[PDB]
Design an enzyme around this catalytic site. Structure first.
Site, mmCIF file in Angstrom:
data_model
loop_
_atom_site.group_PDB
_atom_site.id
_atom_site.type_symbol
_atom_site.label_atom_id
_atom_site.label_comp_id
_atom_site.label_asym_id
_atom_site.label_seq_id
_atom_site.Cartn_x
_atom_site.Cartn_y
_atom_site.Cartn_z
ATOM 1 N N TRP A 112 -31.778 27.984 20.652
ATOM 2 C CA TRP A 112 -31.295 26.632 20.834
ATOM 3 C C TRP A 112 -29.921 26.657 20.196
ATOM 4 O O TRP A 112 -29.603 27.563 19.421
ATOM 5 C CB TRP A 112 -32.190 25.585 20.165
ATOM 6 C CG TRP A 112 -32.556 25.908 18.766
ATOM 7 C CD1 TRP A 112 -31.767 25.784 17.658
ATOM 8 C CD2 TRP A 112 -33.796 26.455 18.317
ATOM 9 N NE1 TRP A 112 -32.442 26.234 16.550
ATOM 10 C CE2 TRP A 112 -33.689 26.653 16.926
ATOM 11 C CE3 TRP A 112 -34.991 26.806 18.962
ATOM 12 C CZ2 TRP A 112 -34.735 27.191 16.163
ATOM 13 C CZ3 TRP A 112 -36.030 27.342 18.203
ATOM 14 C CH2 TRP A 112 -35.891 27.528 16.817
ATOM 15 N N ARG B 131 -31.985 34.365 13.096
ATOM 16 C CA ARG B 131 -32.967 35.445 13.002
ATOM 17 C C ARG B 131 -34.262 35.207 12.239
ATOM 18 O O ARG B 131 -35.159 36.047 12.283
ATOM 19 C CB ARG B 131 -32.303 36.732 12.520
ATOM 20 C CG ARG B 131 -31.444 37.393 13.590
ATOM 21 C CD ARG B 131 -30.821 38.670 13.071
ATOM 22 N NE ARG B 131 -29.673 38.438 12.196
ATOM 23 C CZ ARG B 131 -29.149 39.362 11.389
ATOM 24 N NH1 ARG B 131 -29.677 40.583 11.336
ATOM 25 N NH2 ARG B 131 -28.079 39.073 10.659
ATOM 26 N N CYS C 73 -26.249 37.051 14.737
ATOM 27 C CA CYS C 73 -27.127 35.892 14.889
ATOM 28 C C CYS C 73 -27.616 35.270 13.582
ATOM 29 O O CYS C 73 -28.245 35.937 12.761
ATOM 30 C CB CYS C 73 -28.328 36.257 15.762
ATOM 31 S SG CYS C 73 -29.426 34.878 16.173
ATOM 32 N N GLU D 181 -21.281 25.419 17.669
ATOM 33 C CA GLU D 181 -20.892 26.192 18.843
ATOM 34 C C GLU D 181 -20.273 25.296 19.908
ATOM 35 O O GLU D 181 -19.350 25.696 20.615
ATOM 36 C CB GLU D 181 -22.106 26.942 19.417
ATOM 37 C CG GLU D 181 -22.720 27.929 18.460
ATOM 38 C CD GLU D 181 -23.969 28.578 19.021
ATOM 39 O OE1 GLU D 181 -23.848 29.594 19.740
ATOM 40 O OE2 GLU D 181 -25.073 28.073 18.724
#
Ligand code: HEM
Ligand code: HEM
Ligand SMILES: C[C@H](O)[C@H](O)[C@H]1CNC2=NC(N)=NC(=O)C2=N1
Ligand SMILES: C[C@H](O)[C@H](O)[C@H]1CNC2=NC(N)=NC(=O)C2=N1
Ligand SMILES: N=C(NO)NCCC[C@H](N)C(=O)O
Ligand SMILES: N=C(NO)NCCC[C@H](N)C(=O)O
Lengths: 361, 361
Positions: free
Chosen positions: B236, B69, B66, B241
């Site tokens: 979000w 973070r 991720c 992506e």
């Protein structure tokens, strides 16, 4: 004691594998006895013109970080294990640049110099690449990646004009000498490509250019226990190396903001993706420029496509494929290539090319 | 026997670390005895509202893959360990979508459901993400990544309209039931964003759209030996992506060629870098669209910049930083971010989120 034990072990493994590929299985027995007596008599052994030639190809094939491995068996192996003087080395290096360049139609080549004997080098090349630009400081001038070597060259009597594209001289040391010698590169031998854009005329205002042929000269070639610390090799450039790294990295030429300016976009907001658009246009400029001047270059999509074909051939040959995902993926649009969507085994298989400590710094 | 030994060990490690961070060192002794007696009496232990809340945050902090973070301590923890019926779960999931969406200003949240007791699940969520499009075959329709789950849903009485953007229903199984139940999502609860370009009007001809909030619902949350197999979470979207993967991959929506068409460029030559240009324009379209509709989204440069700040904070806090380079780097212009230029330790530290076997397939 232990050195004469590692050498023999690596030799047996190499001769068997190499000879097996050459359709040479019966000559293995008679070649290994000759090698055993040579290691006892002198303390090392000498490769035949067929062994090191194929060994250099096998090393390329095992290079995990190289996307251009499909062409491994077409490598032009130049044998210069007969060099004794600094002039011999200088001419061999000049010859490499000339024959590899081949007036633009780049030929993947490698020049083999005498290997190490009792752990001591015969020829030591200081250049990272035979052709490369210098780097300086007050405010950034030239290529930052070349700073330490530039300083070393300057401590030997060389002086650069301090432009952003000064050609570093060839610098190498011979066995028996404390300090290295240097030779300025003949400009007629080095092809350089001015960067221009096919649709944007203002792109030439950036006055960017790059050299045509990348010749890594500081890596160690290891073949059957024999260490060729001096064995310069070259392929042709993949556009991304120049437009997405050499000219883009903040620690290198850092040109993205200036690129954004000439193509007419704002650098105000990350959401506009100006860096990405600048990268695309700069990379398009690089491919178009090299092609225009008749110098070989490959785009990352074609390169990945060629590499996919390499993966298939390795599976067809019965060989395990090794690779470093982090280096194989292109710095631009990596998810658009197949490489991104799979995993690679980053195991080290010999023969191969290795990093070695820099004599300067 | 051995299960009651692993649980206690993971509990001691967690309570000490968690309590240490909460400025809670003296209550560790009296909390561990209560836990020891609870494990002997029942065979497991129940977290306090403060433990799992911070545990969920710590798990996010330890999520190597991720990039978002930096916001770990702001996570909205919804406690639903009191759910018993399928309706309780359905409403909790509906509530999650509603409160997380927050009319566009997305709130990073996680809903905690009852964990596993004697290795058996209380609530089992089948959806990969709460909101996600279906996928079908003859010729490709919808999202290919959703094919197996779509088939499973269809084997339960559900039927999709077979458009490219059919909303999968919520599908989960309760303890004691052999087959899962399903509920169609209320459209008023799901925000979707039609993709348009700021400068290119023809972009709307592609009729692309995506949903506003990604809510991973099939990962296991592990906190102090307690396995929360059902604990949906959301952040979000990072533009990449959607425009560089979901809509770009050949195995997903594969829209690059169609994008190239509406922006007016040829798909004839890789050297023109049409895929790269298509990617930039499609990604610009995504960021502009979400922003226009008031739905939170972050570009990869801003995201990497926020992540750099996370690295600094971890060093300031005395904590070891862990990360997966291969997932942290954005699929577009990765070398333009700092992440590309450094290395990360891909060690697994608990608490964390883990993959679990899919009940379907
Ligand atoms: C034929 C054209 C070639 C292409 C298109 C090609 C391309 C590449 C690329 C893109 C990289 C990454 C470079 C970087 O990121 O700095 C690389 C690395 C490498 N290649 Fe090649 N290559 C070619 C030929 C060769 C040859 C002729 C050899 C050896 C005989 C070779 C050996 C290697 C090795 C060892 C690396 C790693 C270099 C390092 O660690 O800095 N390549 N190659
Ligand atoms: C706050 C906004 C957030 C952003 C911008 C963000 C961004 C990202 C991105 C870009 C990825 C890669 C996704 C992919 O390639 O499929 C990722 C993965 C991940 N994130 Fe987040 N994230 C956010 C919030 C969260 C939260 C709230 C949690 C947990 C409480 C979390 C847990 C993880 C985990 C475990 C992964 C790996 C998922 C997988 O393996 O499929 N993230 N994140
Ligand atoms: C740590 C990481 O391996 C390095 O930053 C990498 C990643 N990928 C890379 N790719 C390429 N082509 N050249 C590099 O120098 C490089 N370095
Ligand atoms: C094998 C490799 O780890 C996978 O293909 C990766 C690489 N990087 C990735 N990055 C992101 N953001 N999502 C992924 O699914 C992903 N998958
Ligand atoms: N493509 C090749 N060889 O063929 N690359 C070698 C390293 C080149 C280096 N990345 C540079 O930009 O100078
Ligand atoms: N950015 C987040 N969470 O906040 N991502 C989660 C995975 C999302 C997934 N990659 C998708 O495109 O659906």
């Amino acid at each position: 004691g232990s050195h004469m034990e590692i050498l023999w072990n690596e030799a047996k493994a190499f001769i068997a594998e190499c000879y097996q590929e050459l359709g040479k299985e019966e000559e293995v027995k008679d070649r290994l006895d000759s090698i055993k007596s040579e290691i006892d008599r002198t303390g090392s052994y000498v490769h035949t013109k067929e062994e090191l030639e194929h060994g250099a190809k096998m090393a390329w094939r095992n290079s995990n970080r190289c996307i251009g491995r499909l062409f491994w068996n077409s490598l032009n192996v130049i044998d210069r294990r007969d060099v004794r003087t600094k002039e011999d080395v200088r001419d061999a290096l000049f010859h490499h640049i000339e024959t590899a360049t081949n007036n633009g139609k780049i030929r993947p080549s490698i020049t083999i110099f005498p290997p190490e004997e009792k752990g001591e080098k015969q020829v030591e090349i200081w250049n990272h690449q035979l052709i490369r630009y210098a780097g300086y400081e007050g405010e950034r001038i030239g290529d930052p990646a070349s700073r330490s070597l530039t300083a070393a060259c300057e401590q030997l009597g060389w002086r650069g004009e301090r432009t952003d594209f000064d050609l570093l001289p060839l610098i190498f040391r011979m066995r028996g000498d404390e300090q290295p010698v240097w030779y300025e590169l003949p400009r007629s031998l080095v092809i350089e490509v001015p960067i221009t854009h096919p649709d944007i005329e203002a792109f030439s205002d950036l006055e960017l250019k790059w050299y045509g042929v990348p010749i890594i000269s500081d890596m160690k070639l290891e073949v059957g226990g024999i260490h060729y610390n001096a064995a310069p090799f070259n392929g042709w450039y993949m556009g991304t190396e120049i437009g997405a790294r050499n000219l883009a990295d903040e620690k290198r030429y850092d040109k993205l903001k200036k690129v954004a300016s000439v193509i007419g976009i704002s650098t105000n907001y990350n959401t506009d993706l100006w860096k990405d658009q600048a990268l695309v246009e700069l990379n398009k400029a690089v491919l178009y420029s090299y092609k225009k001047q008749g110098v070989s270059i490959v785009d990352h999509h074609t390169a990945a496509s060629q590499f996919k074909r390499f993966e298939e051939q390795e599976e067809e040959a019965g060989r395990k494929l090794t690779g470093d995902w982090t280096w194989l993926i292109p710095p631009i649009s990596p998810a658009a290539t197949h490489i991104f969507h799979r995993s690679y085994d980053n195991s080290i298989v010999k023969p191969n090319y290795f990093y070695q400590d820099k004599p300067y710094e």
